[PDB]
């Protein structure tokens, strides 16, 4: 997945997405890391998860926040722009096609913030069950269902409603 993402996402938009890479150096760093509760004890193997699972959600909650501001800037910018071409088109009509293209760059704008909705969902549920998996426990996927499930970025209908608006326009 960490190819697949680097390959879609966005360029413009690189720094906004799910640092999914970043992620997966910090879960080997964890592992490789690990003291082993024969060289030292059982106090000190789980202080080391535990200040390490810390760190991580903490990173997981400022990584979800930042998705959530980005995504809600382009709805806003996105809700701007239909205004402007809807207005646009009940004043002077369709006219000879530059709106038309204006309409179809717009409609493309909606489709990818709503890949950006999937790839950023996608990229935590991956990185939570691969945090699972290393540390064999159920953390993370509760993490993602009690705070990403809900999280705004992945709830929102709006832009879902902007496209069939924008679907009866250009009908």
């Known amino acids: 997945f960490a ?5 879609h996402i966005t360029p413009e938009w690189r720094k906004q997405y799910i640092q999914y890479e970043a992620f997966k150096d910090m879960l080997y760093s964890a592992q490789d890391q690990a003291p082993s509760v024969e060289v030292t004890d059982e106090d000190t193997v789980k202080r080391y998860f535990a200040k390490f699972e810390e760190k991580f959600f903490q990173t997981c909650e400022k ?4 998705i959530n501001t980005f995504y ?21 009509g369709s006219g000879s096609g530059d709106l038309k293209l204006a309409f179809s760059e717009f409609y493309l704008s909606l489709i990818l913030l709503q890949n950006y909705q999937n790839l950023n969902f996608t990229g935590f549920r991956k990185i939570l069950k691969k945090h699972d998996k290393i540390l064999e426990t159920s953390r993370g996927a509760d993490w993602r269902v009690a705070h990403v499930e809900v999280a705004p970025f992945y709830t929102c209908k709006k832009i879902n409603q902007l496209i069939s608006e924008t679907e009866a326009v250009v009908t």
């Open 3 to 7: 190819e697949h993402l680097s390959a």
């Open 63 to 66: 990584e979800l926040a930042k």
């Open 72 to 92: 809600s800037e382009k709805l806003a910018e996105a809700q701007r722009r239909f205004a402007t071409l809807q207005n646009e088109l009940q004043s002077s």
